[PDB]
Design a binder for these strands. Structure first.
Ligand SMILES: [Mg+2]
Ligand SMILES: [Mg+2]
Ligand SMILES: [Mg+2]
Ligand SMILES: [Mg+2]
Ligand SMILES: [Mg+2]
Ligand SMILES: [Mg+2]
Lengths: 264, 313, 126, 285, 379
RNA sequence: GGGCUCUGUGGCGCAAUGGAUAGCGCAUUGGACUUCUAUAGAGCA
RNA sequence: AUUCAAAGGUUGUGGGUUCGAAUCCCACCAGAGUCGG
């Protein structure tokens, strides 16, 4: 089963199989915020870790797919064996690269040996005609993305406000979690919409291949909506070909929805 | 009602200055919290000059022909004037004319004969062939120019060329201020921004279609298109104060996006009023003379386009 | 024009506003002359104190509902739901999902038309 | 109880060599135009399959560097910085500070250089992965997560990001007499006009970084940098927009350098810029 | 050269002067008329270059001419009696003015260049004062103004008929400022000038019923294209229009009874044969000559003063901004504003002394520091 | 002025290598937008 | 409401090792930091 690391109230995923499981099984996509190991001078594509919203992590803990732990701290009693293990591993992984290095080098030489011999003979025969006319830094090391040692963490309680879960009880979290869970149960894909002036973006499928269909705005069933805001949001939705949704959780448990579109 | 060299008098109707060329005070009536002018001279002067107000039927100007645009090419072969109407629209005007007929007590069998004599200041109905015959006027539909509140106040207060009537008794910019403030509870900030902008030579219009407060045209809708889209706010000179609409970073992102799509600029205006001011000193218009204005322009810094601000051809 | 039959008939409906009645008159004038609708009428909902126009864009199709609102006002999703239920009660047919048209009218008689439905509508596949 | 978190994938020699001979071209995100309606049988399904199998290959990629291209560093948490154990490289022309005879890095510079792969961070004689570094360096004492996000976002485009040390610095009157815009009885203010008495509310938003463009990278003088291109405040997207008093305070603190607001929305960076404006009275026709 | 002309009844003697010449005529036998003024017995009077003399005769006469003449001959092509007809018809108006407590007729001589505006104005004024009347003469043609220097508007109280060569004696002659040769440069000036002098003589005729009864005579511009006709109707409906007479282009008749009130009697006339062509050079030197007959007087009877005027003494407004003193002010004009007291001409400039020397019809001090300078120069 | 360390690759920020094919991003130029707002302009799942 | 393609080179200059140099070595220009005078 999966495990998400909640530090200071933010949820990160550090493995590559947990992201695949999340997206291909539970319909949760997250957001990659790291850097790429092969593209580290660009903002187009990014890599691990994957950042989860608090609502996604709460939903995943509740349906029983992940386990929110608190980020561990080094124990300081497991340090000496750690040191000796690292030293042995470094030494053996260094002195075992030399072997396949030597083999690969002999192979990259015997592949174009004929060219070497031809060039050498040309060199020395033109030298003859002229005569008649006169370790470290090569040892490879890996920079790990996720911690390489098994540790023990203590499970976090998401239904009680704490230090590394400041979310429980806040009203905005309850509202947005109500709407997130309702939309996710209906089979939709979901993302964040800050640049579109809303709360969520709602897709009919994996956002890798589909354009979103809705921009969702979480509202309290008694809060007043300013008209100008409705007009600006409807115009923006018309400009990008997206309906404007209005979601509100009713006291009886069920959420109510309302579409907004420009007419004539 | 003064701030001008011509007639700086609140509500004297006995015009007397002396050395002047020719000023003709305009007229307007306040019907259920809306100022309207019903005279052709008044309409044409207010709209050809500064582009004041909006036509109550058309979109841009009071130019709603009750003729039909599609059938202008129908019989342009003939020599006649503007009125050419299909039959069923005049039939509907006859419906809501028999409305008036029954509402004034005349029974049906005499209504039919009286209007049959009126279907023998007037119109021309049209009708195998389709011909036309002169008819009598079914219902009056004469145009009215509908002026915004800030517009009408800038006209009466800041220029003096307009007089408003509420039950045939003219008003004053003391009780005009009071009435406009009590019907639209946010008249003061909007009129202060309107006064500030139209005093720089710009032309302010309402920005309802975009979600903002105003739009600024360089010299008018027909000459130029709007450049700036303005939102108005009021605060104290220690920056205490409530807000008309609270701005998140989702309202501003949406407003900025929809302004970039329509090639405009998102200006946020602030009106700063002193802390020594009281809610009865700001019950007079002349409080304007001690309030300050501040514009800011909100933009969208794009990270990848501004990493070399020297490259340009 | 204040003597227009529809203005006085709107006065008749015991609603209790000068803003709402004049804005309703303005939207009626915008529909019945500019947009060329047919058979537009005016019904009052005293449950919500709303003067609402019920019309037919072109003769042969179903009825539509238009609630003329000014910009000064503001709504909550609960009142939106109240008006959706009122509209459904009004035009009658429970087949199509509840929906109405909100006509936001400015001070100088500038109108913007939005359409509120109950459920999920797709952006533009019609 | 206590759950035991599994951890890590160790690249073998044969796969370290394979990761050395890596390409440089990124895969295309979507293979052509995205769809609009999910109703389909086998084209959409196979297209999604391929668009996914390419994602699980990118994210399962580890950094592999040589032991000589790597500067060796150490993390001093009590003093609060990173100490290099070797001479720095080309990054030392825009990043770091030399004190007491040794070269040192702030925590966010160290984390960004660990992510790029230019240094090799240690802590208590043991090297740190990127998870452990994220957990150690990104506290509330050193630097927060949003500030590091903005810092790295900018630094991956080419900019010079330094820490902001407060010690851094017509109408119808058809009268042919027009002058008559004397109607102006509404005085215009400015942003720094009265910010030296507003600083008494020294709380709320704060300037965090100075930003120099990428044209300033080849001739940058760390000791005498000059006047920056921008200053940066870093907030969140769910947070209150700054007021007029806070805008005046920040616009007086900054000076005559422009000031930018960076908002992070669940991992997405966006930049806005408030600027005082003076409408041109000129409209003369 | 002595020439004998016999001008029998209903005949026009056409003669005008060669350049730099002298002409001497005297009514030897009988009576004769000069533009409405009956010339006295055997009076030897002189005629200077460029001056036009189309003398029609009522009773015929025997005329002596000693000197050279550009054109000089007898003509039976004469419409001048139609002249009288207009007058004689409007002669009714004359006494009918004081019949029913009404005020007299005022009449326009409207038409383009080369029509005889001032010819009919001549005869109408002279015959007015012949029948005991005392007419108001308003001249507006700033191109060749004779009420003052051209580039101004003027008004004359006709005490007695004009003399043979010089004319009606200027006693309190109304002058007002225009500044330029052509109203095409600024119409607002002509507009408020028309209204100004119209209401001015409104007051004068209501306080001096003399001209109220005796009516008025006007001279307007010869403009027929552009805002000329618009200002023509402006002036007519401002000048209490009674009768308007068109000068031999009936296009004026068509549009003139198309844009006046029905009350206005529009009467057309073909001009006399005595209307001679006068191109640019003519009114050029006749404008400079009107400046000369303002400042130096006919035959040199005006002796003006030539000396300094302080910049600390006078302020000028240029038709609205006062003009900073610059050496562009040489040989322009200056109007002393009270109405207008008089006019003066500039000769030289003093910078560090800050005084410019002027030539003056009256001595120091000038009755006002109110001055308005010219657009045209004369030296 | 002298010593020591580091750096120099496409307009800019940068990869690569026992030492065996000089390519990534931004900017630029072009297309399609099942795009939108209207010859444009704007495009940030 | 996005998505795709093309073009773009004095690898600071010279020399050396090498069959083969952006890559390894030396010298010389240009720049940054530090020690210090
Ligand atoms: Mg290089
Ligand atoms: Mg280069
Ligand atoms: Mg470079
Ligand atoms: Mg190579
Ligand atoms: Mg795009
Ligand atoms: Mg070299």
């Amino acid at each position: 089963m999966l495990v998400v690391e909640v530090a200071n109230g933010r949820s990160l995923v550090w493995g590559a199989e947990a992201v695949q499981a999340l997206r291909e099984r539970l319909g949760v996509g997250g957001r990659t915020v790291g850097a790429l190991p092969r593209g580290p001078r660009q903002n187009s594509r990014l890599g691990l870790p994957l950042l989860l919203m608090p609502e996604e992590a709460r939903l995943l803990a509740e349906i029983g797919a992940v386990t929110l732990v608190s980020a561990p701290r080094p124990d300081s009693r497991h340090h000496s064996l750690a040191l000796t293990s690292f030293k042995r591993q470094q030494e053996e992984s260094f002195q075992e690269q030399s072997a396949l290095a030597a083999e690969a080098r002999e192979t990259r030489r015997q592949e174009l040996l004929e060219k070497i011999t031809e060039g050498q003979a040309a060199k020395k025969q033109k030298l003859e005609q002229a005569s008649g006319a006169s370790p470290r830094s090569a040892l490879l090391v890996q920079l790990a993305t996720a911690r390489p040692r098994p540790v023990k963490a203590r499970p976090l309680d998401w239904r009680v406000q704490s230090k590394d879960w400041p979310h429980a009880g806040r009203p905005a979290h309850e509202l947005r979690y109500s709407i997130y869970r309702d939309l996710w149960e209906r089979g939709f894909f979901l993302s964040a919409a800050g640049k579109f002036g809303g709360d969520f973006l709602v897709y009919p499928g994996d956002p890798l291949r589909f354009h979103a269909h809705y921009i969702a705005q979480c509202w309290a069933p008694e809060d007043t909506i300013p008209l100008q805001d409705l007009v600006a949001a409807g115009r923006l939705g018309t400009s990008v070909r997206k309906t404007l949704l209005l979601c509100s959780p009713q006291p009886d448990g069920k959420v109510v929805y309302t579409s907004l579109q420009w007419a004539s | 009602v003064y701030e001008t060299y011509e007639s700086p008098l609140p509500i004297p109707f006995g015009q007397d200055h002396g050395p002047l060329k020719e000023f003709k005070i305009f007229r307007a009536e306040m019907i259920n919290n809306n100022v309207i002018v019903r005279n052709a001279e008044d309409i044409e002067q207010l709209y050809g000059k500064g582009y004041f107000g909006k036509g109550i039927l058309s979109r841009s100007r009071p130019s709603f022909t009750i003729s039909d645009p599609k059938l202008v090419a129908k019989w342009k072969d003939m020599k006649t004037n503007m009125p050419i109407i299909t039959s069923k629209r005049y039939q509907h005007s006859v419906e809501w004319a028999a409305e008036l007929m029954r509402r004034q007590g005349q029974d049906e069998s005499t209504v039919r004969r009286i209007l049959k004599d009126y279907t023998k200041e007037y119109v021309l109905v049209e009708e195998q062939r389709n011909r036309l015959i002169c008819r009598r006027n079914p219902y009056r539909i004469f145009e009215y120019l509908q002026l915004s509140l800030e517009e009408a106040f800038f006209l009466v207060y800041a220029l003096g060329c307009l007089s408003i009537y509420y039950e045939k008794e003219p008003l004053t910019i003391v009780k005009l201020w009071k009435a406009f403030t009590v019907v639209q509870p946010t008249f003061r900030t909007t009129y202060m921004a309107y006064h500030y902008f139209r005093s720089k030579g710009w032309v302010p219009k309402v920005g309802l279609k975009y979600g903002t407060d105003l739009l600024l045209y360089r010299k008018g809708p027909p000459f130029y298109h709007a450049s700036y889209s303005v939102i108005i706010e009021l605060v104290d000179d220690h920056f205490e104060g409530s807000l008309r609409r609270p701005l998140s970073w989702k309202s501003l992102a949406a407003l900025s996006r929809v302004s970039v799509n329509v090639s405009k600029e998102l200006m946020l205006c602030y009106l700063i009023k002193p802390s020594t001011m009281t809610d009865k000193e700001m019950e007079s218009p002349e409080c304007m003379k001690r309030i300050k204005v501040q514009e800011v322009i909100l933009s969208r810094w794009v990270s990848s386009r501004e990493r070399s601000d020297q490259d340009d051809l | 024009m204040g003597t227009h039959p529809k203005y006085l008939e709107m006065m008749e409906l015991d609603i209790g506003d000068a803003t709402q009645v004049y804005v309703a008159f303005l939207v009626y004038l915008d529909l019945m002359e500019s947009k060329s609708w047919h058979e537009v009428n005016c019904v009052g909902l005293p449950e919500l104190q709303l003067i609402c126009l019920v019309g037919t864009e072109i003769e042969g199709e179903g009825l539509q509902t238009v609630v003329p609102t000014p910009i000064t006002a503001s709504l909550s999703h609960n009142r939106i739901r109240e008006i959706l239920k009122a509209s459904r009660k009004l035009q009658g047919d429970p087949d199509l999902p509840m929906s109405f048209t909100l006509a936001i009218v400015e001070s100088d008689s500038t109108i913007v038309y939005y359409k509120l439905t109950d459920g999920f509508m797709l952006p533009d596949p019609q | 109880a206590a759950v035991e978190v599994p951890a890590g994938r160790v690249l073998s020699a044969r796969e370290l060599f394979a990761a050395r001979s890596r390409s440089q071209k990124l895969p295309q995100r979507s293979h052509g135009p995205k769809d609009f309606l999910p109703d389909g049988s086998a084209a959409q399904a196979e297209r999604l399959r391929r668009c996914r199998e390419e994602l699980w290959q990118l994210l399962a990629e580890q950094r592999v560097e040589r032991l000589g291209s790597l500067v060796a560093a150490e993390w001093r948490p009590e003093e609060g910085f990173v100490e290099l154990k070797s001479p720095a490289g080309k990054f030392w022309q825009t990043m770091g500070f030399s004190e007491q005879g040794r070269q040192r890095l702030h925590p966010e510079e160290a984390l960004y250089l660990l992510e790029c792969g230019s240094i090799h961070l240690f802590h208590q004689d043991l090297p740190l992965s990127i998870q452990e570094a994220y957990q150690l360096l990104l506290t509330d004492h050193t630097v927060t997560f949003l500030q590091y996000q903005v810092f790295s976002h900018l630094k991956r485009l080419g900019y010079v990001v330094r820490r902001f040390q407060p010690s851094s610095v017509p109408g119808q009157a058809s009268s042919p007499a027009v002058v008559l815009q004397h109607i102006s009885v509404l005085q215009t203010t400015h942003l720094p006009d009265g910010g030296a008495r507003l600083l008494e509310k020294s709380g709320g938003l704060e300037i965090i970084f100075d930003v120099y463009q990428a044209d300033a990278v080849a001739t940058f003088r760390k000791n005498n940098p000059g006047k920056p291109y921008a200053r940066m405040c870093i907030s969140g997207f769910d947070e209150p927009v700054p007021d007029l008093c806070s805008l005046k305070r920040l616009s007086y603190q900054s000076g005559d350098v422009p000031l930018i607001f960076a908002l992070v929305d669940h991992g997405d960076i966006s930049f806005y810029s408030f600027r005082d404006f003076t409408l041109p009275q000129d409209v003369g026709h | 050269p002595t020439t004998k002309f016999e001008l029998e009844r209903e005949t026009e003697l056409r003669f005008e002067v060669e350049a730099s010449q002298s002409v001497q005529l005297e009514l030897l036998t009988g009576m004769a008329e000069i533009f409405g003024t009956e010339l006295t017995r055997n009076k030897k009077f002189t005629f200077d270059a460029g001056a036009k003399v189309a003398v029609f005769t009522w009773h015929g006469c025997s005329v002596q001419l000693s000197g050279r003449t550009e054109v000089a001959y007898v003509s039976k092509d004469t419409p001048m009696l139609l002249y009288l007809n207009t007058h004689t018809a409007l002669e009714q108006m004359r006494r009918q003015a004081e019949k029913e407590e009404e005020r007299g007729p005022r009449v326009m001589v409207v038409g383009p260049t080369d029509v005889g505006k001032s010819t009919v104005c001549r005869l109408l004024l002279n015959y007015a004062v012949r029948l005991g009347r005392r007419p108001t003469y308003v001249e507006l043609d700033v191109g060749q103004g004779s009420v003052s220097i051209p580039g101004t508007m003027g008004a004359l109280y006709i005490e007695r008929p004009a003399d043979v060569e010089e004319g009606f004696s200027i006693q309190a002659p109304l002058v007002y400022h225009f500044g330029s040769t052509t109203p095409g440069t600024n119409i607002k000036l002509y507009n408020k000038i028309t209204s100004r002098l119209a209401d001015v003589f409104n007051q004068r005729c209501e306080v001096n019923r003399r001209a109220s009864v005796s009516g008025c005579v006007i001279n307007t511009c010869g403009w027929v294209k552009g805002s000329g006709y618009q200002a023509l109707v402006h002036a007519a409906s401002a000048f209490e229009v009674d009768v308007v007479v068109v000068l031999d282009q009936e296009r004026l008749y068509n549009e003139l009874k198309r844009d006046l009130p029905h009350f206005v009697r529009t009467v057309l006339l073909p001009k006399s044969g005595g209307v001679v062509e006068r191109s640019k050079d003519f009114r050029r030197e006749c404008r400079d000559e009107r400046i000369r007959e303002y400042f130096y007087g006919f035959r040199g009877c005006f002796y003006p003063h030539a000396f300094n005027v302080k910049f600390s003494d006078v302020k000028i407004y240029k038709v609205l901004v006062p003009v900073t003193p610059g050496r562009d002010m040489v040989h322009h004009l200056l109007s002393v504003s009270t109405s207008v007291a008089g006019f003066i001409v500039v000769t030289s400039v003093d910078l560090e002394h800050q005084v410019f020397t002027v030539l003056s019809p009256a001595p120091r001090p000038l009755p006002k520091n109110f001055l308005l300078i010219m657009d045209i120069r004369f030296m």
